[PDB]
């Protein structure tokens, strides 16, 4: 688990980008009230 690359600004629209290294995926931790892969949708 580590910081997302700087390349990823705006992948996680309303959330925070997380770089799961060993597992080789990026994850958006969504702000409360936002869902989606990129935290794109509300409620």
């Amino acid at each position, epitope marked *: 688990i*580590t*910081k*997302c*690359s*700087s*390349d*990823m600004n*705006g*992948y996680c629209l309303h959330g925070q980008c997380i*770089y799961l*290294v*060993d*597992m*080789s*995926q*990026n994850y958006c931790r969504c702000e409360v009230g936002y869902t*989606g*892969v*990129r935290c*794109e949708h509300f409620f």
Partner: antibody
Amino acid sequence: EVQLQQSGAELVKPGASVKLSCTASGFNIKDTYMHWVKQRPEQGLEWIGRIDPLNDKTKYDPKFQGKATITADTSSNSAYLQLSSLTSEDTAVYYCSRGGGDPVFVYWGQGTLVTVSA
Amino acid sequence: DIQMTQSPSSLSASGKVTITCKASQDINKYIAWYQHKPGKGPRLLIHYTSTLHPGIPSRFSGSGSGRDYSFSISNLEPEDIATYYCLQYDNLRTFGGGTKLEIKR
């Protein structure tokens, strides 16, 4: 399961223009940056650029600005590379790939050959 | 924007080869190393400098920090004769020039 499938080979008069397509199975391109990558024969890998199909914004490697235009159609789950004023320099295989969820390229299309020749 | 130089362009050993890669800016460990072959897409081996990618043999061994990086195969049994690309992704994307391997005889 991830599939990227690109359109067929192209043969283009020099000076002309072509528009390649990449269509994605197994995921929504709204949730991902779609990238295009050039490989000119016997030569390595050139990163062409990317689009965000969600907001249609784009970035390009400055070597390609003016030459490439990357678009997306969320409707058909497709991204497109369009190359203007073709020269023999543009004669290459073009690969699409995805980013966002993938920190780096992992899945690719089968590649599309563009042969610029009269 | 941000340049990548991968030495050497080709080499031969029969062995233990390692490839270098240095970058215009330092890229905070966001490099990856690809292995390319005829008609195939470039398969990813190593991401984040060192972290092996789920389902890859443990002889591949990237390394480094800052502007300067390494990639090493243990021994090219036999599949691993091919071309190798370093890729930064700290800010946009840039491929290294590549490294083609031959079998020294």
